[PDB]
Protein backbone atom coordinates (compact mmCIF):
# COMPACT_ATOMS: atom_id res chain seq x y z
CA UNK A 1 0.00 0.00 0.00
CA UNK A 2 1.40 3.36 -1.13
CA UNK A 3 -0.39 6.50 0.08
CA UNK A 4 -0.88 9.35 -2.39
CA UNK A 5 -1.72 12.97 -1.38
CA UNK A 6 -4.74 12.94 -3.73
CA UNK A 7 -6.57 10.73 -1.19
CA UNK A 8 -5.85 7.42 -2.95
CA UNK A 9 -3.66 4.40 -2.35
CA UNK A 10 -1.91 2.27 -4.95
CA UNK A 11 -2.00 -1.45 -4.19
CA UNK A 12 0.51 -3.43 -6.24
CA UNK A 13 -0.99 -6.60 -7.71
CA UNK A 14 0.17 -9.63 -5.74
CA UNK A 15 1.86 -12.41 -7.79
CA UNK A 16 -0.47 -14.57 -9.95
CA UNK A 17 -3.06 -15.80 -9.45
CA UNK A 18 -3.83 -13.52 -6.50
CA UNK A 19 -3.26 -10.10 -8.09
CA UNK A 20 -5.19 -10.90 -11.32
CA UNK A 21 -8.04 -12.26 -9.18
CA UNK A 22 -8.32 -9.06 -7.13
CA UNK A 23 -8.23 -6.98 -10.33
CA UNK A 24 -11.08 -9.12 -11.70
CA UNK A 25 -13.04 -8.66 -8.46
CA UNK A 26 -12.88 -4.86 -8.57
CA UNK A 27 -13.58 -4.84 -12.33
CA UNK A 28 -16.70 -6.97 -11.79
CA UNK A 29 -18.06 -4.92 -8.87
CA UNK A 30 -17.35 -1.52 -10.45
CA UNK A 31 -18.39 -2.55 -13.98
CA UNK A 32 -19.85 0.55 -15.65
CA UNK A 33 -22.77 -1.52 -17.00
CA UNK A 34 -23.43 -3.40 -13.74
CA UNK A 35 -27.15 -3.47 -12.90
CA UNK A 36 -26.82 -6.22 -10.25
CA UNK A 37 -28.31 -4.76 -7.05
CA UNK A 38 -26.14 -7.02 -4.87
CA UNK A 39 -22.92 -5.68 -6.40
CA UNK A 40 -24.21 -2.08 -6.45
CA UNK A 41 -24.95 -2.31 -2.70
CA UNK A 42 -21.53 -3.90 -2.08
CA UNK A 43 -19.81 -0.77 -3.47
CA UNK A 44 -20.79 1.15 -0.31
CA UNK A 45 -18.53 -1.11 1.81
CA UNK A 46 -15.46 -1.20 -0.48
CA UNK A 47 -12.78 1.42 -1.18
CA UNK A 48 -13.81 3.45 -4.22
CA UNK A 49 -12.10 1.97 -7.28
CA UNK A 50 -10.33 4.19 -9.81
CA UNK A 51 -9.28 1.36 -12.14
CA UNK A 52 -6.00 -0.38 -12.90
CA UNK A 53 -2.92 1.84 -12.86
CA UNK A 54 0.67 1.41 -14.05
CA UNK A 55 3.62 3.87 -14.19
CA UNK A 56 3.83 5.85 -17.48
CA UNK A 57 7.12 4.10 -18.32
CA UNK A 58 6.37 0.62 -16.90
CA UNK A 59 3.21 -1.07 -18.32
CA UNK A 60 4.44 -4.27 -16.63
CA UNK A 61 3.99 -2.90 -13.10
CA UNK A 62 0.31 -3.33 -12.25
CA UNK A 63 -1.53 -1.55 -9.42
CA UNK A 64 -5.08 -0.97 -8.26
CA UNK A 65 -5.93 2.68 -7.64
CA UNK A 66 -8.12 2.70 -4.52
CA UNK A 67 -9.67 5.21 -2.15
CA UNK A 68 -7.52 5.88 0.90
CA UNK A 69 -10.07 5.07 3.60
CA UNK A 70 -7.89 6.83 6.21
CA UNK A 71 -7.55 10.08 4.24
CA UNK A 72 -10.23 12.15 6.00
CA UNK A 73 -8.76 11.53 9.49
CA UNK A 74 -6.28 13.75 11.33
CA UNK A 75 -4.64 11.09 13.52
CA UNK A 76 -6.18 7.85 12.15
CA UNK A 77 -6.19 4.79 14.39
CA UNK A 78 -6.13 1.81 12.04
CA UNK A 79 -6.80 -1.89 12.59
CA UNK A 80 -6.86 -4.60 9.92
CA UNK A 81 -8.88 -7.72 10.78
CA UNK A 82 -8.98 -10.80 8.54
CA UNK A 83 -12.50 -12.26 8.48
CA UNK A 84 -13.62 -15.88 8.18
CA UNK A 85 -13.13 -19.42 9.47
CA UNK A 86 -10.84 -20.42 6.59
CA UNK A 87 -7.99 -18.29 5.21
CA UNK A 88 -7.57 -20.79 2.35
CA UNK A 89 -9.85 -20.99 -0.69
CA UNK A 90 -11.87 -23.90 -2.22
CA UNK A 91 -9.03 -24.71 -4.65
CA UNK A 92 -6.08 -24.84 -2.24
CA UNK A 93 -3.77 -27.86 -2.21
CA UNK A 94 -3.30 -29.97 0.92
CA UNK A 95 0.06 -28.20 1.34
CA UNK A 96 -1.53 -24.74 1.12
CA UNK A 97 -4.41 -25.58 3.49
CA UNK A 98 -1.90 -26.82 6.07
CA UNK A 99 0.20 -23.67 5.55
CA UNK A 100 -2.78 -21.35 6.05
CA UNK A 101 -4.20 -23.18 9.07
CA UNK A 102 -0.76 -23.37 10.73
CA UNK A 103 -0.42 -19.58 10.33
CA UNK A 104 -3.36 -19.29 12.76
CA UNK A 105 -5.04 -22.58 13.81
CA UNK A 106 -7.71 -20.72 15.82
CA UNK A 107 -9.31 -19.25 12.68
CA UNK A 108 -12.14 -21.82 12.56
CA UNK A 109 -12.97 -21.24 16.22
CA UNK A 110 -12.67 -17.44 16.40
CA UNK A 111 -13.70 -16.47 12.85
CA UNK A 112 -11.30 -13.51 12.64
CA UNK A 113 -7.64 -12.60 13.09
CA UNK A 114 -6.19 -9.18 13.92
CA UNK A 115 -3.57 -8.52 11.24
CA UNK A 116 -2.25 -5.37 12.94
CA UNK A 117 -3.11 -2.03 14.50
CA UNK A 118 -1.76 1.50 14.67
CA UNK A 119 -3.03 3.40 17.70
CA UNK A 120 -2.47 7.11 18.34
CA UNK A 121 -1.92 7.98 22.01
CA UNK A 122 -2.82 11.53 23.01
CA UNK A 123 -0.59 11.94 26.05
CA UNK A 124 2.63 10.86 24.30
CA UNK A 125 1.74 12.28 20.85
CA UNK A 126 2.90 9.02 19.29
CA UNK A 127 1.84 5.72 17.72
CA UNK A 128 2.08 2.24 19.10
CA UNK A 129 1.76 -0.48 16.48
CA UNK A 130 1.11 -4.23 16.58
CA UNK A 131 2.36 -6.53 13.82
CA UNK A 132 0.86 -9.82 12.61
CA UNK A 133 2.46 -11.72 15.52
CA UNK A 134 0.19 -9.88 17.97
CA UNK A 135 -3.12 -11.12 16.53
CA UNK A 136 -1.68 -14.59 15.86
CA UNK A 137 -0.87 -14.81 19.60
CA UNK A 138 -4.47 -14.12 20.67
CA UNK A 139 -6.60 -16.96 22.02
CA UNK A 140 -10.23 -17.32 23.07
CA UNK A 141 -9.14 -16.23 26.56
CA UNK A 142 -7.39 -13.05 25.35
CA UNK A 143 -9.28 -12.01 22.19
CA UNK A 144 -11.52 -9.47 23.97
CA UNK A 145 -8.59 -7.64 25.58
CA UNK A 146 -6.65 -8.11 22.33
CA UNK A 147 -9.32 -6.22 20.39
CA UNK A 148 -9.92 -3.68 23.20
CA UNK A 149 -6.30 -2.52 22.82
CA UNK A 150 -7.23 -0.81 19.53
CA UNK A 151 -9.72 1.45 21.34
CA UNK A 152 -7.43 2.62 24.12
CA UNK A 153 -6.17 6.12 23.56
CA UNK A 154 -3.76 7.78 25.99
CA UNK A 155 -6.72 8.20 28.45
CA UNK A 156 -10.00 6.30 28.05
CA UNK A 157 -11.59 3.39 26.27
CA UNK A 158 -13.21 4.78 23.12
CA UNK A 159 -16.59 3.10 23.56
CA UNK A 160 -17.96 5.65 21.05
CA UNK A 161 -15.76 4.13 18.31
CA UNK A 162 -16.62 0.62 19.53
CA UNK A 163 -20.37 1.24 19.19
CA UNK A 164 -19.97 2.93 15.79
CA UNK A 165 -17.92 -0.09 14.65
CA UNK A 166 -20.71 -2.49 15.64
CA UNK A 167 -23.26 -0.39 13.74
CA UNK A 168 -21.17 -0.33 10.55
CA UNK A 169 -20.26 -4.04 10.75
CA UNK A 170 -23.99 -4.77 11.12
CA UNK A 171 -24.62 -3.14 7.72
CA UNK A 172 -21.89 -5.29 6.14
CA UNK A 173 -23.35 -8.36 7.88
CA UNK A 174 -26.76 -7.39 6.46
CA UNK A 175 -25.24 -7.39 2.95
CA UNK A 176 -23.75 -10.86 3.52
CA UNK A 177 -27.08 -12.21 4.79
CA UNK A 178 -28.71 -10.96 1.55
CA UNK A 179 -26.32 -12.44 -1.04
CA UNK A 180 -25.32 -15.95 -2.16
CA UNK A 181 -23.09 -15.25 -5.15
CA UNK A 182 -19.69 -14.48 -3.55
CA UNK A 183 -17.57 -16.19 -0.90
CA UNK A 184 -14.64 -14.25 0.56
CA UNK A 185 -11.46 -15.93 1.84
CA UNK A 186 -8.49 -14.20 3.49
CA UNK A 187 -10.25 -10.83 3.07
CA UNK A 188 -10.22 -8.11 5.74
CA UNK A 189 -12.11 -5.31 7.44
CA UNK A 190 -10.19 -2.06 7.82
CA UNK A 191 -11.18 -0.10 10.93
CA UNK A 192 -10.38 3.59 11.21
CA UNK A 193 -11.32 6.09 13.93
CA UNK A 194 -10.11 9.56 14.89
CA UNK A 195 -7.31 9.52 17.48
CA UNK A 196 -6.93 13.30 17.88
CA UNK A 197 -14.09 12.98 16.76
CA UNK A 198 -16.92 11.27 18.68
CA UNK A 199 -18.46 8.18 17.06
CA UNK A 200 -16.76 8.79 13.69
CA UNK A 201 -15.51 5.50 12.22
CA UNK A 202 -14.74 3.82 8.91
CA UNK A 203 -15.18 0.08 8.41
CA UNK A 204 -14.38 -1.05 4.86
CA UNK A 205 -13.92 -4.46 3.24
CA UNK A 206 -10.47 -4.87 1.63
CA UNK A 207 -8.11 -7.46 0.10
CA UNK A 208 -9.95 -9.53 -2.52
CA UNK A 209 -7.37 -11.97 -3.92
CA UNK A 210 -9.50 -14.95 -2.79
CA UNK A 211 -13.09 -14.05 -3.68
CA UNK A 212 -15.00 -16.76 -5.54
CA UNK A 213 -18.44 -17.32 -7.13
CA UNK A 214 -20.78 -19.34 -4.92
CA UNK A 215 -24.32 -20.69 -4.57
CA UNK A 216 -24.43 -20.28 -0.77
CA UNK A 217 -24.28 -17.81 2.07
CA UNK A 218 -20.68 -17.09 3.06
CA UNK A 219 -21.19 -18.83 6.40
CA UNK A 220 -17.56 -18.45 7.55
CA UNK A 221 -17.61 -14.70 6.94
CA UNK A 222 -21.00 -14.34 8.66
CA UNK A 223 -19.70 -16.27 11.69
CA UNK A 224 -16.59 -14.08 11.88
CA UNK A 225 -18.65 -10.88 11.65
CA UNK A 226 -21.05 -12.09 14.35
CA UNK A 227 -18.27 -13.13 16.74
CA UNK A 228 -16.49 -9.82 16.12
CA UNK A 229 -19.76 -7.97 16.87
CA UNK A 230 -20.19 -10.03 20.05
CA UNK A 231 -16.64 -9.22 21.21
CA UNK A 232 -17.08 -5.49 20.51
CA UNK A 233 -20.45 -5.55 22.32
CA UNK A 234 -18.82 -7.03 25.45
CA UNK A 235 -16.19 -4.25 25.36
CA UNK A 236 -19.05 -1.75 25.76
CA UNK A 237 -19.55 -3.29 29.24
CA UNK A 238 -15.97 -2.58 30.41
C1 LIG B 1 -2.66 4.31 6.06
C2 LIG B 1 -3.21 3.08 5.73
C3 LIG B 1 -2.80 1.93 6.40
C4 LIG B 1 -3.37 0.70 6.07
C5 LIG B 1 -2.95 -0.45 6.74
C6 LIG B 1 -4.34 0.62 5.07
C7 LIG B 1 -4.75 1.77 4.38
C8 LIG B 1 -5.69 1.78 3.43
O9 LIG B 1 -6.46 2.86 3.25
N10 LIG B 1 -7.31 2.59 2.26
C11 LIG B 1 -7.07 1.35 1.83
C12 LIG B 1 -7.68 0.67 0.85
C13 LIG B 1 -7.28 -0.63 0.54
C14 LIG B 1 -6.24 -1.19 1.28
C15 LIG B 1 -5.82 -2.44 1.01
N16 LIG B 1 -6.32 -3.24 0.08
N17 LIG B 1 -5.64 -4.39 0.14
N18 LIG B 1 -4.71 -4.28 1.10
N19 LIG B 1 -4.83 -3.07 1.65
C20 LIG B 1 -5.65 -0.42 2.28
C21 LIG B 1 -6.06 0.83 2.54
C22 LIG B 1 -4.18 3.00 4.73
The technique by which this structure was obtained is X-ray
User: Using an 8 Å Cβ cutoff, are 143 and 231 in contact?
Assistant: yes
Taking the C-alpha atoms of residue 25 and residue 208, their distance in angstroms, rounded to an integer, is 7
Residue 80, annotated as binding a ligand: yes
Give the SS3 label for residue 16: coil
Interval between CA 1 and ligand 1 midpoint (Å): 6
Mutate which of 82, 184, 190, 209 to test ligand 1's pocket (most atoms within 8 Å of Cβ)? Answer: 190
Q: Where are the domains of the chain?
A: 1-238
Give Cβ neighbours of residue 65 (< 8 Å, ≥ 6 apart): 8, 9, 10, 49, 50, 51, 52, 53
**Contact residues of ligand 1, CB 6 A cut-off:** 1, 3, 9, 11, 47, 66, 68-70, 78, 80, 190, 206-207
CA–CA separation, 127 and 121 (whole Å): 6
- Ligand-binding annotation for 18, yes or no, is yes
Dmax (CA) for the chain in angstroms is: 55
The atom of ligand 1 lying closest to the CA of 207 is 17
Amino acid sequence: ILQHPDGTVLKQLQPPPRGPRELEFYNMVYAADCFDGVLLELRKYLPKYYGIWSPPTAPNDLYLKLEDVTHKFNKPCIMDVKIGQKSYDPFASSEKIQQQVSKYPLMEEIGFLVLGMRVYHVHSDSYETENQHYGRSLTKETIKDGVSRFFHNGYCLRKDAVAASIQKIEKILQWFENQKQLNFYASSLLFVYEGSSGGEVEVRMIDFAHVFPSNTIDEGYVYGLKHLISVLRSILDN
